[PDB]
Scaffold this active site. Structure first.
Site, mmCIF file in Angstrom:
data_model
loop_
_atom_site.group_PDB
_atom_site.id
_atom_site.type_symbol
_atom_site.label_atom_id
_atom_site.label_comp_id
_atom_site.label_asym_id
_atom_site.label_seq_id
_atom_site.Cartn_x
_atom_site.Cartn_y
_atom_site.Cartn_z
ATOM 1 N N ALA A 1 -63.944 -7.209 -77.716
ATOM 2 C CA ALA A 1 -63.754 -8.651 -77.599
ATOM 3 C C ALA A 1 -64.982 -9.477 -77.970
ATOM 4 C CB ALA A 1 -63.285 -9.002 -76.203
ATOM 5 N N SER B 1 -64.837 -12.534 -80.971
ATOM 6 C CA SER B 1 -65.197 -13.941 -81.050
ATOM 7 C C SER B 1 -66.341 -14.040 -82.022
ATOM 8 C CB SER B 1 -65.641 -14.474 -79.688
ATOM 9 O OG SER B 1 -64.527 -14.725 -78.845
ATOM 10 N N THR C 1 -58.419 -22.497 -74.667
ATOM 11 C CA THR C 1 -56.988 -22.189 -74.644
ATOM 12 C C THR C 1 -56.704 -20.814 -75.211
ATOM 13 O OG1 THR C 1 -54.788 -23.198 -74.880
ATOM 14 C CG2 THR C 1 -56.103 -22.968 -76.884
ATOM 15 N N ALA D 1 -53.025 -26.315 -68.447
ATOM 16 C CA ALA D 1 -53.139 -27.186 -69.618
ATOM 17 C C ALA D 1 -52.496 -26.531 -70.848
ATOM 18 C CB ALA D 1 -54.592 -27.498 -69.893
ATOM 19 N N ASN E 1 -46.356 -27.127 -77.224
ATOM 20 C CA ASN E 1 -47.578 -27.036 -76.426
ATOM 21 C C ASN E 1 -48.549 -28.144 -76.824
ATOM 22 O OD1 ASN E 1 -47.755 -25.121 -74.306
ATOM 23 N ND2 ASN E 1 -48.412 -23.439 -75.650
ATOM 24 N N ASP F 1 -44.488 -28.108 -71.504
ATOM 25 C CA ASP F 1 -43.463 -27.435 -72.296
ATOM 26 C C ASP F 1 -42.812 -26.295 -71.529
ATOM 27 O OD1 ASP F 1 -45.730 -25.708 -72.373
ATOM 28 O OD2 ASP F 1 -44.995 -24.765 -74.196
ATOM 29 N N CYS G 1 -79.356 -26.554 -65.810
ATOM 30 C CA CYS G 1 -78.991 -25.098 -65.925
ATOM 31 C C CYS G 1 -80.116 -24.329 -66.585
ATOM 32 C CB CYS G 1 -77.722 -24.871 -66.734
ATOM 33 S SG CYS G 1 -76.852 -23.384 -66.181
ATOM 34 N N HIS H 1 -74.408 -29.217 -64.968
ATOM 35 C CA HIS H 1 -74.814 -29.971 -66.152
ATOM 36 C C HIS H 1 -74.479 -31.449 -66.130
ATOM 37 C CE1 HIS H 1 -74.817 -25.799 -67.532
ATOM 38 N NE2 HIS H 1 -75.578 -26.167 -68.547
ATOM 39 N N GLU I 1 -75.384 -33.628 -68.027
ATOM 40 C CA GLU I 1 -75.248 -34.096 -69.396
ATOM 41 C C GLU I 1 -73.859 -33.884 -69.976
ATOM 42 O OE1 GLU I 1 -76.977 -31.216 -68.748
ATOM 43 O OE2 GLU I 1 -77.018 -29.913 -70.513
HETATM 44 N N1 LIG Z 1 -56.678 -15.011 -72.691
HETATM 45 C C1 LIG Z 1 -56.857 -16.207 -72.279
HETATM 46 N N2 LIG Z 1 -58.071 -16.798 -72.250
HETATM 47 C C2 LIG Z 1 -58.304 -18.054 -71.826
HETATM 48 N N3 LIG Z 1 -57.341 -18.884 -71.380
HETATM 49 C C3 LIG Z 1 -56.160 -18.280 -71.417
HETATM 50 C C4 LIG Z 1 -55.817 -17.018 -71.830
HETATM 51 N N4 LIG Z 1 -54.450 -16.788 -71.701
HETATM 52 C C5 LIG Z 1 -53.962 -17.900 -71.224
HETATM 53 N N5 LIG Z 1 -54.933 -18.849 -71.029
HETATM 54 C C6 LIG Z 1 -54.753 -20.207 -70.511
HETATM 55 O O1 LIG Z 1 -53.867 -20.161 -69.399
HETATM 56 C C7 LIG Z 1 -53.054 -21.134 -69.342
HETATM 57 C C8 LIG Z 1 -51.595 -20.788 -69.185
HETATM 58 O O2 LIG Z 1 -51.198 -19.794 -70.140
HETATM 59 P P1 LIG Z 1 -49.737 -19.726 -70.644
HETATM 60 O O3 LIG Z 1 -48.862 -19.848 -69.453
HETATM 61 O O4 LIG Z 1 -49.591 -18.639 -71.595
HETATM 62 O O5 LIG Z 1 -49.637 -21.117 -71.364
HETATM 63 P P2 LIG Z 1 -48.384 -21.720 -72.119
HETATM 64 O O6 LIG Z 1 -47.221 -21.800 -71.229
HETATM 65 O O7 LIG Z 1 -48.891 -22.974 -72.661
HETATM 66 O O8 LIG Z 1 -48.029 -20.694 -73.231
HETATM 67 C C9 LIG Z 1 -53.328 -22.020 -70.537
HETATM 68 O O9 LIG Z 1 -54.038 -23.026 -70.096
HETATM 69 C C10 LIG Z 1 -54.079 -21.104 -71.461
HETATM 70 O O10 LIG Z 1 -54.982 -21.698 -72.344
HETATM 71 MG MG LIG Z 2 -46.949 -23.839 -72.292
HETATM 72 MG MG LIG Z 3 -47.691 -18.906 -74.425
#
Ligand SMILES: Nc1ncnc2c1ncn2[C@@H]1O[C@H](COP(=O)(O)OP(=O)(O)O)[C@@H](O)[C@H]1O
Ligand SMILES: [Mg+2]
Ligand SMILES: [Mg+2]
Ligand SMILES: Nc1ncnc2c1ncn2[C@@H]1O[C@H](COP(=O)(O)OP(=O)(O)NP(=O)(O)O)[C@@H](O)[C@H]1O
Ligand SMILES: [Mg+2]
Length: 1285
Positions: free
Chosen positions: A316, A320, A394, A668, A712, A874, A1125, A1250, A1252
């Protein structure tokens, strides 16, 4: 330590206790589980310094010093058996590289390399050698470390090696057979038709191919590097096809070319952004300034799947990491802005939390379990994003492992070979989107870190983010130069390493390139030309700079401490060559095309298969048990364990993170960032993905992907649907029955229809075609196979960042209006309900109306703009029930809805995963919002559910028949259990528990404010009006990642921010005697190795000239120093230079033993701090993001005195108001909630959160409805202005 080791001397330096109590407790706990009678155990870190020269007393002490870090834990005298754990020999670890950096920056040149290991002292002493290897096995990573029986045994780690020569395949003397032998020996995976090619080409030349040349070829012409499947001629059911897969994806760009600046010819795609004030430090003046110019948005998303299955963390991290190189290397240079993580694995099977649908199906002995990937994986990518400096806002997380009857009969369908997704966005300067031409004689540089052999076992990657940061600042420095940007053409280094990176560069420039093997930096001399040209080391970039710009590039790199090396020149004649200056010969020589050589185009002649699949059996299903099960499915359950491990505040442009509302529920739907620190324009990131559906209908899954992405991202002001640009990432098992035809049909579905029909474009992608794992379970073979996993990542240009909506419901008069795009098809197939009951179902959800989907978008766009909605969310995993549940969790209240107008199938009405969502409009607005939705023919889809009330009742009715009634807090808790459980096995059990147990108290008032001052009163205005701008040294050390926003804050406060790098002082360029205000910035100085802030502070403390410079600063009667920080820990180690800082604590590892990215609530307490003047008594939330912010005192009396002297400026408080030491309302676990202290004369104030990153109101996760542009934290900076006269 000073025992004989080659041309050097190895020194052994004892360190601090490693494992922090609760871990040791879990260790012995696991030891008993294997019948190993282990009574006690003590872990101690031990350092090894490989010296080339000797250290005099003063130096010998300076070393012992640098090696005293971490938490001051009680030391034990060695007893029992010793078991040393060092990285596997022939490997240099990131800790080493960063740690060794520090040594050198501290004048210890005798220090050749520093390496660390853990020394276990075990007491069981009644086990056979057999039982001992087991004990050992539980103490290291078989894929990275190794155990030693003597501390002195670690000498094997620094063994010097002689450069191995290049070997040659004897074609001329042995015949084609030689090509066959070498093909297996070197494992080149070359096909028949290709060995034929090589065979001829080398006979035409008349010399034997060099193993290096052969391997490079293998790379350049592999399925991955040439994307052969995606460019093959297709034949589905005897009928040949017109377009390939890529050509069909390319279709979306021919039909909707709008807003696209670059696509299919770079490391990423670039679309139009907005007219914002690009903020950065000027090259000459060394002062941050706003440059009013177009800031364009680039996007990319990659998949580091296989390497993730072998060793998760590296997988991982370099996931990234690789993507970030592409972003940075986009066009002529750009800057990554934000990012998105993504995971797909098999059943977790958390011990003692075994779910009803989980059944152990075995797995290959050679890989790691799904739970393992989900423990170490998240931490890896997060580790990189945090160290580097980009917010992960996200993503998705999905589990699926079932013996489902699909397209090829009944098989095992899962993700034993995991989907490791990592992508994101960035901003690129207008005149840089295009790569420049590579003029003949262009210096071909390699910007990046020293190579090691990285690309069985050779799937175990390495990650050193702080090295990539340095490189990023060098990229930055370059594009910041406007037209003087020295980078004629930059490109990222990835697969095949340089043996593909370099040729690829000179080719994208119609040039060739003569290179010199020995000019390339390498941390392992022993390597072979093949190994140095084809090793897949990390943190590297390739670029071409005009000869006369070399001086500038050098000076830029040096200043940033980012290494680089000129390794060759651009030739006019198409021709690649590699000269070896050590073996005085030439490992590579051949016309460029001889490498980029081709044979037949692939042709896949497949057949279609459609899963018959039987209808969902409802024996065990009951609405009630359904809700309880769904909220327990990883894919649905709260994701707190992936959100908080990754920074979501850095850059100070994070307008919309995962956490929503006063209760920080991570619900979110998309991520929204502000395009600049002086604007309300921005970017948006959403993620569509619904891979299970592919086990019943390939086109549907593909379509639903674009659908969810859209639904979304809809509650965001974007405008024209043409502004949204999609990136399609295709995961599949090419070769597996029917999946092939299914791939083509699914690609056709979005490529040639759904996307072009809506107006959507697909300028970026990537493809993994081997999502299946084969192994031996019994005497029979088992195969785990993935569905057609399409992952659509949406990226768009936000018009007004302020109008984005979240799921946070309102208790005021309202209406929950459902927009069912399913048109009442209420399908249950391939859903959470089905999966949770071990089934596949009958028919799955699908995009029903292509025109209504766009109608949905246009409709939503209209409202978002008109401010008619109060909330949005959604519908996806877990259907409407989960969508309504989350909105209830987010708003911490209740729901009274009715699902009668949704049909008799109440089960299907609540769990249909059809497209759509729920909108919460004010009551007085219902009619108009219904009328608007009507204008878009959506009137047929909209249904009135009911309203949201203040409370704890989650009730769903059907006329006068209570369909489901439960406590919202009960559900809120079950949904959280999955994340609660992960945190237990990963973080400190105490913390995981406290966080979960507090979710049970419905009387939690969430984040709430109190203001001792007027946050709108700009007490700086009078000074700004005189035009006199005081200079402020915005200090940064290698590794720092904040600074830009920090400058922008002091800047708004009327200041004149100046860019001062530590190198700027050590090199003498700048002097502190000219500044009245200093500021140590945040980040990961030296990657936090040797202790956070430690190496940074000791680099000052050691060099006398710079030491003096700083002391003479604090002692002066008119200065002000701040330390947010990282820079808080840095200064806290300079206590010996700062007047009035004797009682100060030391900042160490968080109690939870995990990085904390939280929006925590602090209280401003009374203290001398001039920076916090007139804010005393106030209570606002702040951007907390750190892994070593825990306050540590020598003993009670120390804290007793520190408190008593009143040096505390900031304390954490629960949502109620009392100072709490409970997690995570107090993230780190600092006594009496301390995260900020000051001096006796309040001129210097250090803190951990932070201020800032949240000086802008829009940058606060959650904040009161009526706040202006400025946040309460802006004051701090305005105080520095006032205070400075
Ligand atoms: N692997 C991940 N890393 C960081 N955030 C994650 C990850 N998987 C899901 N999330 C976050 O968790 C939240 C809910 O996920 P999920 O229910 O799959 O969202 P959605 O219903 O929009 O598809 C979202 O805010 C999403 O960005
Ligand atoms: Mg969703
Ligand atoms: Mg999803
Ligand atoms: N299947 C695909 N669909 C859409 N775009 C694609 C696809 N394959 C490649 N591309 C894009 O076309 C360009 C090049 O393919 P590529 O193999 O991705 O090199 P790369 O992503 O720049 N760098 P690296 O990840 O280190 O090999 C990039 O801009 C891709 O995003
Ligand atoms: Mg969800």
């Amino acid at each position: 330590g000073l025992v004989p080791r080659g041309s050097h001397m190895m020194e052994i330096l004892r360190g601090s206790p490693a494992l922090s109590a609760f871990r040791i407790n879990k260790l012995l706990a696991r030891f008993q589980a294997a019948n190993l009678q282990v009574h006690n155990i003590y872990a101690e870190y031990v350092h090894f310094a490989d010296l080339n020269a000797p250290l005099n007393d003063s130096e010998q002490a300076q070393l012992t010093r640098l090696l005293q870090y971490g938490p001051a834990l009680s030391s034990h005298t060695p007893a029992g058996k010793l078991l040393l754990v060092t990285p596997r020999p022939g490997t240099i670890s990131p800790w080493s590289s960063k740690a060794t950096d520090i040594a050198h920056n501290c004048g210890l040149q005798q220090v050749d390399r520093l390496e660390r290991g853990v020394a276990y002292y075990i007491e069981a002493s009644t086990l056979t050698a057999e039982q001992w290897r087991q004990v050992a096995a539980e103490l290291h990573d078989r894929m990275m470390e190794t155990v030693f029986s003597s501390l002195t045994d670690a000498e094997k780690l620094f063994i010097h090696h002689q450069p191995a020569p290049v070997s040659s395949v004897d074609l001329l003397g042995e015949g084609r057979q030689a090509l066959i032998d070498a093909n297996l020996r070197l494992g080149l995976a070359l096909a028949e038709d290709e060995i034929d090619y090589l065979q001829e080409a080398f006979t035409k030349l008349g010399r034997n191919p060099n193993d290096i040349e052969l391997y490079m070829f293998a790379q350049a012409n592999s399925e991955h590097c040439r994307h052969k499947i995606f460019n093959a001629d297709w034949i589905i059911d005897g009928k040949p096809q017109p377009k390939s897969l890529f050509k069909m994806i390319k279709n979306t760009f021919e039909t909707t070319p709008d807003y696209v600046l670059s696509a299919y010819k770079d490391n990423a795609a670039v679309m139009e952004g907005s007219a914002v004030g690009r903020y950065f430090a000027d090259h000459n003046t060394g002062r941050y300034d706003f440059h009013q110019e177009p800031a364009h948005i680039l996007m990319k998303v990659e998949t580091h799947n296989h390497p993730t299955a072998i060793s998760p963390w590296p997988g991982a991290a370099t996931g990234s990491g690789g993507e970030i190189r592409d972003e940075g290397a986009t066009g002529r240079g750009a800057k990554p802005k934000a990012g998105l993580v993504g995971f797909s694995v098999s059943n977790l099977r958390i011990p003692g939390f075994e779910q009803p649908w989980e059944e152990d199906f075995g797995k290959p002995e050679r890989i790691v379990t799904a739970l393992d990937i989900m423990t170490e994986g998240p931490l890896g990518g997060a580790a990189f994003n945090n160290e580097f400096g980009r917010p992960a806002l996200t993503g998705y997380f999905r589990t699926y492992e079932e013996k489902v009857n699909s397209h090829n009969g009944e098989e095992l369908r899962g993700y034993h070979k995991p989907i490791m997704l990592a992508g994101g966005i960035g901003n690129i300067r207008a005149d840089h989107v295009q790569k420049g031409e590579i003029v003949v004689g262009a210096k071909l540089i390699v910007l990046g870190g020293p190579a090691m052999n990285i690309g069985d076992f050779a799937s175990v990657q390495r990650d050193n983010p702080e090295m990539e940061r340095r490189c990023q600042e060098v990229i930055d420095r370059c594009w910041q130069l406007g037209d003087a940007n020295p980078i004629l053409f930059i490109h990222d280094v990835g697969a095949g390493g340089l043996s593909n990176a370099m040729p690829e560069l000179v080719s994208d420039g119609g040039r060739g390139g003569k290179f010199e093997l020995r000019d390339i930096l390498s941390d392992e001399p022993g390597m072979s030309p093949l190994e140095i040209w084809c090793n897949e080391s990390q943190e590297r970039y390739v670029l071409a700079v005009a000869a006369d710009q070399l001086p500038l590039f050098d000076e830029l790199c040096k200043r940033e401490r980012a290494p680089y090396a000129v390794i060759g020149d651009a030739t006019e004649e198409q021709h690649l060559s590699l000269h070896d200056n050590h073996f005085d010969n030439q490992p590579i020589d051949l016309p460029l095309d001889v490498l980029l050589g081709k044979t037949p185009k692939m042709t896949r002649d497949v057949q279609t298969l459609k899963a018959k699949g039987d209808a969902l059996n409802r024996a065990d299903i009951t609405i009630a048990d359904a809700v309880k099960r769904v909220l327990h499915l990883p894919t649905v359950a709260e994701k707190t364990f992936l959100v908080t491990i990754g920074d979501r505040t850095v850059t100070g442009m994070v307008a919309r993170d995962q956490m929503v509302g006063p209760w920080q529920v991570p619900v979110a739907d998309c991520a929204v960032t502000t395009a600049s620190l002086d604007s309300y324009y921005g970017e948006a990131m959403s993620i569509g993905e619904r891979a299970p559906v592919a086990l019943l209908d390939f086109a549907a899954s593909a379509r639903l992907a674009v659908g969810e992405a859209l639904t979304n991202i809809a509650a965001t002001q974007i405008g024209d649907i043409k502004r949204i640009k999609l990136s399609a990432n295709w995961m599949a098992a090419a070769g597996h029955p029917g999946e092939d035809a299914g791939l083509y049909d699914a690609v056709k579905a979005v490529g040639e229809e759904l996307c072009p029909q809506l107006g959507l474009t697909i300028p970026v992608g990537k493809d993994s075609m081997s999502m299946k794992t084969r192994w031996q379970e019994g005497n029979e073979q088992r195969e785990m196979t993935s569905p057609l996993s399409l992952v659509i990542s949406a990226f768009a240009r936000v018009e007004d960042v302020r109008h984005t909506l979240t799921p946070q419901l309102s208790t005021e008069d309202n209406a929950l209006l459902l927009i069912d795009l399913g048109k009442g098809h209420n399908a249950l197939g391939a859903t959470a309900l089905a999966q949770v009951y071990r089934q596949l179902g009958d028919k799955p959800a699908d995009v029903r109306d292509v025109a209504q989907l766009k109608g949905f978008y246009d409709a939503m766009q209209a409202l978002v703009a008109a401010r008619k909605l109060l909330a949005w969310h959604d519908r996806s995993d877990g259907g409407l029930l989960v969508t309504l549940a989350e909105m209830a969790f987010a708003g911490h209240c209740g729901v009274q809805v009715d699902i009668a107008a949704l049909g008799d199938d109440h089960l299907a009405a609540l769990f249909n995963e059809e497209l759509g969502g729920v909108i919460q409009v004010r009551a007085e607005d219902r009619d108009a919002v219904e009328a608007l939705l009507a204008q878009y023919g959506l009137a047929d889809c909209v249904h009135y559910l009911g309203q949201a009330l203040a409370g704890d009742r989650f009730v769903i009715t059907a006329n006068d028949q209570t369909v489901f009634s439960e406590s919202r807090t009960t559900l809120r808790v079950w949904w959280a259990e999955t994340t609660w459980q992960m945190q237990r096995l990963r973080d400190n059990p105490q913390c995981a528990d406290q966080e979960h147990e507090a979710k049970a108290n419905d009387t939690d008032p969430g984040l709430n404010v109190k203001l001792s001052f007027d946050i709108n009163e700009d007490i700086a205005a009078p000074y700004i009006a005189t035009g006199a701008r005081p200079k402020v040294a915005v200090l940064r050390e290698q590794g720092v990642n904040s600074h830009v926003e920090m400058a922008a804050a002091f800047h708004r406060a009327g200041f004149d921010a100046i860019d001062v790098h530590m190198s700027d002082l050590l090199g003498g360029r700048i002097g502190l005697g000219n500044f009245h205000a200093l500021v140590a910035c945040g980040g990961f100085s030296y990657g936090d190795v040797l202790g956070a802030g430690e190496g940074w502070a000791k680099s000052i403390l050691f060099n006398h000239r710079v030491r003096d410079e700083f002391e003479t600063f604090f002692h002066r009667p008119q200065t002000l120093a701040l330390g947010v920080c990282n820079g808080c820990q840095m200064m806290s180690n300079l206590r010996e230079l700062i007047p009035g800082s004797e009682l100060w604590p030391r900042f160490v590892r968080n109690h939870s033993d995990r990085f904390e990215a939280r929006f925590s609530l602090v209280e401003v307490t009374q203290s001398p701090s001039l920076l916090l003047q007139g804010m005393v008594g106030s209570q606002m939330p702040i951007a907390v993001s750190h892994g070593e912010g825990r306050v540590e005192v020598r003993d009670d009396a120390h804290l007793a005195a520190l408190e008593s002297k009143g040096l505390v400026a900031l304390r954490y408080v629960d949502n109620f108001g009392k100072v709490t030491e409970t997690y995570p309302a107090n993230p780190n676990g600092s006594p009496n909630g301390i995260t900020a202290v000051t001096t006796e004369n309040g001129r210097v104030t250090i803190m951990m959160p932070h201020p800032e990153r949240v000086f802008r109101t829009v940058a606060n996760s959650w904040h009161p409805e009526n706040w202006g542009e400025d946040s309460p934290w802006m004051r701090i900076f305005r105080n520095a202005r006032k205070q400075l006269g």
